[PDB]
Scaffold this motif. Structure first.
Motif, mmCIF file in Angstrom:
data_model
loop_
_atom_site.group_PDB
_atom_site.id
_atom_site.type_symbol
_atom_site.label_atom_id
_atom_site.label_comp_id
_atom_site.label_asym_id
_atom_site.label_seq_id
_atom_site.Cartn_x
_atom_site.Cartn_y
_atom_site.Cartn_z
ATOM 1 N N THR B 5 70.741 25.844 -0.248
ATOM 2 C CA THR B 5 70.750 27.106 0.479
ATOM 3 C C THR B 5 70.495 26.930 1.965
ATOM 4 O OG1 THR B 5 68.394 27.570 0.162
ATOM 5 C CG2 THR B 5 69.889 28.177 -1.623
ATOM 6 N N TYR B 6 69.414 26.259 2.340
ATOM 7 C CA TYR B 6 69.052 26.101 3.737
ATOM 8 C C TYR B 6 69.364 24.690 4.219
ATOM 9 C CZ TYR B 6 64.975 23.860 1.639
ATOM 10 O OH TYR B 6 64.147 23.048 0.901
ATOM 11 N N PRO B 7 69.664 24.518 5.505
ATOM 12 C CA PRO B 7 69.838 23.163 6.035
ATOM 13 C C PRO B 7 68.502 22.445 6.123
ATOM 14 C CG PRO B 7 69.924 24.738 7.811
ATOM 15 C CD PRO B 7 69.857 25.543 6.543
ATOM 16 N N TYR B 10 65.876 18.202 0.794
ATOM 17 C CA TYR B 10 65.510 18.641 -0.544
ATOM 18 C C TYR B 10 64.873 17.486 -1.301
ATOM 19 C CZ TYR B 10 68.425 22.776 0.237
ATOM 20 O OH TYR B 10 68.970 23.937 0.733
ATOM 21 N N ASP C 92 61.310 27.316 5.273
ATOM 22 C CA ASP C 92 62.494 26.991 4.484
ATOM 23 C C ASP C 92 62.865 28.134 3.550
ATOM 24 O OD1 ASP C 92 62.748 24.591 5.734
ATOM 25 O OD2 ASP C 92 62.127 23.357 4.028
ATOM 26 N N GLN C 95 64.580 31.016 5.765
ATOM 27 C CA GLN C 95 65.931 30.675 6.190
ATOM 28 C C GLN C 95 66.902 30.590 5.020
ATOM 29 O OE1 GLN C 95 66.128 27.077 8.550
ATOM 30 N NE2 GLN C 95 68.034 27.744 9.524
ATOM 31 N N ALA C 96 66.401 30.374 3.801
ATOM 32 C CA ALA C 96 67.285 30.234 2.648
ATOM 33 C C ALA C 96 68.079 31.505 2.383
ATOM 34 C CB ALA C 96 66.474 29.850 1.411
ATOM 35 N N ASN C 99 71.315 31.898 5.311
ATOM 36 C CA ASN C 99 72.163 30.742 5.570
ATOM 37 C C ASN C 99 73.490 30.820 4.829
ATOM 38 O OD1 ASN C 99 71.776 28.153 7.186
ATOM 39 N ND2 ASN C 99 72.596 27.331 5.267
#
Lengths: 416, 349, 118
Positions: B5-7, B10, C92, C95-96, C99
């Motif tokens: 989902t996000y840059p 992970y 995180d 932002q998820a 994005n």
């Protein structure tokens, strides 16, 4: 776009183009469910893929008559034809229902177009193809026309009016995706209501904004067709591919070279994987096979015709004679109404002998010298009699010798 | 993890295995699979490129209780390349469809019928059987059920490792990996014996010199023995036919590779005019390949004239009837190098 | 102005308040492939009741990256020069949500690399 100011315009699109090729000895005609942009049944000449899209609506959905819809592979088959080296071609769209009047007129319509050399029916339906093939009379085929056919079975060969002028190929080929068209590019006709005449609706887009009820009726058939074709895979008849290979082979190597041992392009997979034992059965019966080889890919692995005899067994031998008798006939058309006398016959012999010598130089004919490759005969007591000349007849005998291809190569290995 | 989902970075804590893959063209095996396997059901064949691909398609953790799973792990840990999975009942129907398959590997199944049909001269196939699962009979009749086929070999005994359970790894799976490794390293003409078996694989039963002496002639069995210093090695390179030809696996497999490579080399000549200019072009293609093979060391002889010969022409290899029928006949004769098998030390004072 | 063929790219400003956790803090932006949004607004030593809009600093990053590594290189993962700091912290998990779809580009501070365009 519509330009107003001078300068440079920028557009973003996805339209695809193919290089245009040229040829004379291989000009095919396609009979199928095409959708011309103009209402006005007649054979239309198409020079390239760009010209086809300008004159026809590309897509996988046949024109809708009000409702019923049909699935057509004509557009993608033409795309494969141009991708494999096809040149200018003629298109004969079949509109509305398949009446017997259309079938009877097919040989005459093709003859009216003077440049046709090949006949192809790029339709997936087996019953539709059988009707088209049966409509090609023996007079049409014997007049110097060649039919490329799609065999529907691995075990039984096709039956046509002239066996030696036909070649069949098996199996069909899959492709990655079909060509999809917008609603405005899908032809719609037959709709009519109280406030509108039958000619006021032309495409699916106009149908949607005038009557959503029947528009939903049409799209569910379209979606059902799209689901069905997706399950079986995007299967395209292989005759259209072979038409392009014929053009590429003639331009590169010549008519006397077999159209086999050439790699296919643009396809994804074959409809069926064949073994050597199965291909052995088809080859004896006269069915050319599209084979898959790991070191090569997808290649044509047959060069036989439907007639099995020492004369017309091979495609290159049959096609070479068709090309020769076509070019010779063109040369003699400058002599038709000349006086029927000896100086006229001498000019005929010179014209044919000059052409045949050029054919032998390129390697079309067999032999170490021209006397072993051809002969021309015409005379007052050699080929025709006094009665023939009094009737306006002129008879000339031509013979040629061709080179047969090598079909089997046997390796004999020894330990020492 | 698998949902991006996000840059950024992970983190996940897995336990999936990871191996390495080689690339050998002369060893493309097909593994016989039981029909009850869910992965193979409903398909003609499945191509597996590596352990990563097989694990992804399986969508399950590594199960040591699955005969297919351990066979593939043993095969891939030994250096094998991409393979094909075909159900045992479909071997005679799907193998001819596959063009690049060279090895027919019995991954614990019974492929006696398929071998007797597929493995024939000219087909370019070699078979790898499995030896008896029990002890070896000292009367020399533990190989009675095998046909004397010069296109097959038998390996004994079955193997076990650290990750083993009530089922033992079939020897053919590990041997097929040895075939891929040896061919890519030293060539197909070198014996696939006297080489270590990678991983922790060990033979289930011990074989001595006296036991092997009975099964090294006639329908021979190739043994996997352990030696005091060199570890576990493949000891034996004989086929199932005891003849001056095809006695050794290297000679039979070298001719299979040469026939395939030559067939691809001159396959351009099909559907060409059957005249002398075509014959000369084909002779050049065959001679160019044979010289290259001799240069690599695959043929016996100090000069190429002693290693091979090529003949093709009218009244030499084919007659008028052959030419009129479309046949073109070529004769190739090549000499193979045979390994040293017995070493004798003579001691004196 | 921002249409195909016009050769223009737009740099917007993100919301001046906190980011809504329901994922609806970008509902007022059109899905234009020629525009981008950056959040949050920046502050520095020489700052007062007004905060620097993120578009002004980002456009400077565009000039520096293009002259350094070319226009084909992503104008992210690069420090923001000066003493500029984001006004609000983005994690995180925050932002998820933003994005995908009408994505918002974030300016975040990381423990070792300082403030980066993310």
């Amino acid at each position: 776009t519509i330009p107003t100011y001078p300068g440079v315009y920028i557009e973003e699109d996805a339209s695809l183009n193919l290089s245009v090729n040229q040829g004379n000895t291989a000009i095919p005609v396609f009979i199928g469910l095409f959708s011309p942009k103009n209402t006005n049944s007649q054979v239309t000449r198409v020079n390239s893929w760009l010209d086809f899209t300008n004159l026809f609506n590309a897509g996988c959905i046949a024109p809708i008559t009000i409702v019923i819809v049909n699935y057509t592979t004509s557009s993608d088959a033409l795309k494969l034809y141009f991708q494999n080296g096809g040149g200018p071609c003629y298109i004969l769209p079949q509109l509305d229902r398949l009446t017997q009047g259309f079938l009877d007129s097919i040989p005459e319509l093709i003859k009216q177009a003077l440049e046709i050399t090949l006949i192809v029916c790029p339709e997936w339906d087996s019953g539709y193809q059988s009707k088209i093939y049966n409509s090609l009379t023996s007079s049409l085929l014997n007049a110097g026309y060649f039919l490329i056919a799609d065999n529907q079975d691995k075990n039984t060969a096709l039956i046509t009016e002239v066996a030696s002028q036909t070649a069949t190929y098996y199996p069909a080929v899959k492709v990655s995706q079909l060509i999809q068209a917008e609603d405005s590019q899908i032809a719609v006709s037959g709709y009519e209501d109280a406030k509108t005449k039958s000619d006021e609706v032309k495409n699916l887009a106009q149908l949607k904004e005038k009557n959503p009820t029947v528009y939903q009726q049409a799209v569910q058939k379209i979606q059902a067709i799209q689901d069905e074709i997706a399950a079986n895979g995007n299967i395209i008849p292989v005759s259209a591919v072979m038409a392009g290979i014929y053009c590429a082979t003639d331009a590169s190597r010549g008519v006397w070279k077999a159209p086999a041992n050439i790699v296919l392009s643009g396809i994804s997979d074959v409809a069926e994987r064949l073994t050597d034992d199965e291909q052995g059965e088809m080859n004896s019966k006269g069915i050319n096979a599209i084979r898959y080889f790991s070191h090569k890919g997808f290649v044509v692995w047959g060069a036989r015709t439907l007639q099995n005899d020492d004369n017309w067994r091979y495609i290159p031998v049959r096609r070479l004679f068709n090309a020769a008798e076509r070019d010779i006939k063109q040369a003699m058309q400058s002599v038709v109404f000349e006086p029927n006398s000896q100086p006229t016959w001498e000019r005929v012999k010179s014209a044919i002998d000059n052409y045949l010598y050029s054919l032998w130089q390129q390697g079309a004919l067999a032999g170490n010298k021209p006397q072993e490759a051809y002969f021309v005969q015409i005379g007052k007591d050699v080929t025709m009699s006094d009665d023939d000349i009094k009737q306006g007849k002129m008879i000339v005998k031509v013979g040629m010798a061709a080179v047969r291809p090598a079909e089997f190569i046997i390796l004999q290995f020894s330990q020492q | 993890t698998t949902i991006t989902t996000y840059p950024g970075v992970y983190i996940e804590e897995d336990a999936s295995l990871s191996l390495s893959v080689s690339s050998s063209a002369t060893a493309v095996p097909v593994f016989a699979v039981a029909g009850d396997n869910p992965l193979i059901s409903g398909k003609p064949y499945i191509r597996i490129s590596n352990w990563l691909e097989y694990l992804t398609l399986k969508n399950e953790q590594f199960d040591p209780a699955n005969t297919l799973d351990i066979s593939l792990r043993a095969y891939f840990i030994n250096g094998g390349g991409y393979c094909y999975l075909v159900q045992t009942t479909d071997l005679e129907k799907q193998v001819p469809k596959l063009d690049d398959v060279t090895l027919l590997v019995a991954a614990g199944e019974n492929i006696t019928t398929a071998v007797s049909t597929l493995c024939k001269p000219g087909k370019g196939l070699f078979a790898i059987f499995d030896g008896p699962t029990t002890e070896l009979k000292s009367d020399g009749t533990s190989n009675s059920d095998y046909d004397p086929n010069p296109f097959a070999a038998v390996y004994y005994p079955w193997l076990t490792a650290d990750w083993t359970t009530t089922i033992d790894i079939p020897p053919s799976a590990a041997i097929a990996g040895v075939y891929c490794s040896v061919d890519s390293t030293r060539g197909v003409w070198k014996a696939p014996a006297n080489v270590p078996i990678q991983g922790g694989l060990q033979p289930k039963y011990p074989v001595t010199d006296d036991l092997q002496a009975q099964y090294n002639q006639g329908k021979a069995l190739n043994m996997i023995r352990t030696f005091p210093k060199s570890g576990t090695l493949v000891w034996g390179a004989r086929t199932l036919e005891d003849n001056d030809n095809w006695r050794y696996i290297p000679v039979r497999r070298l001719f299979n590779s040469a026939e395939r490579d030559i067939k691809n080399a001159m396959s351009f000549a099909v559907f060409e005019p059957n005249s002398q200019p075509t014959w000369e072009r084909v002779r050049s293609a065959v001679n160019n390949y044979l010289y290259s093979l001799w240069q690599q060391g695959g043929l016996a002889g100090n000069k190429p004239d002693d290693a091979y010969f090529v003949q093709i022409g009218k009244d030499i290899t084919m007659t008028d009837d052959d030419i009129k029928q479309g046949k073109m006949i070529i004769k190739i004769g090549m000499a193979a190098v045979r390994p040293a098998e017995f070493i004798i030390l003579q001691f004196t004072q």
